[PDB]
């Protein structure tokens, strides 16, 4: 009963960031060595835990959230950050305990004519709470006049596509991101490293 991390990391397609995917991992033995012993990752930052200790630790549940963003947006997947992604698409808590892992996926998610399957939320009335997911497509009301589901002056569609192309600067290229959350509740631990 090993935890299925390869399903998350090696999935053929990833979610739009506004509709980020979440895999809930319970009741299993987790071998994180396949992660921290790999050299394919361009971002690997853990908060509240060192990755080299993960095989010796136990948690109530583990969460793996996955999505695609721009490379120059990966810095927003961190506690306390702001920006379009952190404010409107995927927000981490200040007291986050977990890892943020990102790799360049230009070879997979870019198209010469643009990949318009990947979207992000551009307009929102307020910032997202931590771990909140909003997939609504209501017309954004920029003013005080109700929009009645119609685009116009101060009435804007809230989603926008990345349109990923094989650009020359890596900061514009698409990056796949997995965020691992390690949950500790007042309950028996169900996800444990092989050493425990």
């Amino acid at each position: 009963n090993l935890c299925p991390f390869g399903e998350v990391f090696n999935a053929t397609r990833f979610a739009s960031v506004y509709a980020w995917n979440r895999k809930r991992i319970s009741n299993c033995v987790a071998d994180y060595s396949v992660l921290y012993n790999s050299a394919s990752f361009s971002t690997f930052k853990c908060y509240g835990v060192s990755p080299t200790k993960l095989n010796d630790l136990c948690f109530t549940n583990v969460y793996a959230d996955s999505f695609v963003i721009r490379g120059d947006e990966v810095r927003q997947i961190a506690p306390g950050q702001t920006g379009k992604i952190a404010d409107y698409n995927y927000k981490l808590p200040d007291d986050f305990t977990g890892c943020v892992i990102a790799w360049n996926s230009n070879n997979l998610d870019s198209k010469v004519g643009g990949n318009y399957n990947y979207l992000y939320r551009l307009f929102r009335k307020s910032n997202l709470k931590p771990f909140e997911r909003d997939i609504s497509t209501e017309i954004y009301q920029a003013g005080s006049t109700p929009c009645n589901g119609v685009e116009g002056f101060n009435c804007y569609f809230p989603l926008q596509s990345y349109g990923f192309q094989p650009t020359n600067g890596v900061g514009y290229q698409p990056y796949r991101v997995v965020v691992l959350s390690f949950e500790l509740l007042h309950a028996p631990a169900t996800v444990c490293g092989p050493k425990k």
Partner: antibody
Amino acid sequence: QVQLVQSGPEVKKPGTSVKVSCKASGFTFTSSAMQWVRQARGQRLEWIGWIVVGSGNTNYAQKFQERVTITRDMSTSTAYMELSSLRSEDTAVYYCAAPYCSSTNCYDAFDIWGQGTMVTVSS
Amino acid sequence: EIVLTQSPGTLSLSPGERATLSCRASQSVSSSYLAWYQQKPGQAPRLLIYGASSRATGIPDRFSGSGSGTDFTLTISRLEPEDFAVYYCQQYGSSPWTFGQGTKVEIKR
């Protein structure tokens, strides 16, 4: 100080293009929109078309549809209107306008106007 | 397109009188998407009324707006010599966002 500031007057030979700039200060540019209007000397105002700053979506009147391109550059908070295939009927004053926007709300009309840009097309 | 027709073409009144400007639309237009601008010579248009009844920021109380459907009215109650200008109505709820031809308010002397 909430303002829109346009570029100076322009002289263009017929058939060329003119690019008028409009720089915004004092409000949330990222949440706003900009409409471009032209006025002929002693004549009425003529709507050219508008752009949504955040998305860059544009909407032009059919008469200017094949000839005008409205863009924006958010690193400088400046929108631009380019008019191509210039004929003598384009000699006019060109205005940009935008609603004032805070971090949360936007004005429900075009209350900020630029000073205008006089463009003369002749040989 | 939506044609906005203003009335009258020109308007001569002495200071202190009340000026009534009409804007008529070829079809109905939402009240919250009609605006009144005042343009003085050598000057940019200035927003007078928005939403057909709301006064823009800093606009004097002598300026009033009303109307609905295909007929809107701008009223200048305490007409002043500085109010000589061209007044325009614009609809911006349906593309193209057409302007009226304008009404010229002039002062008698």
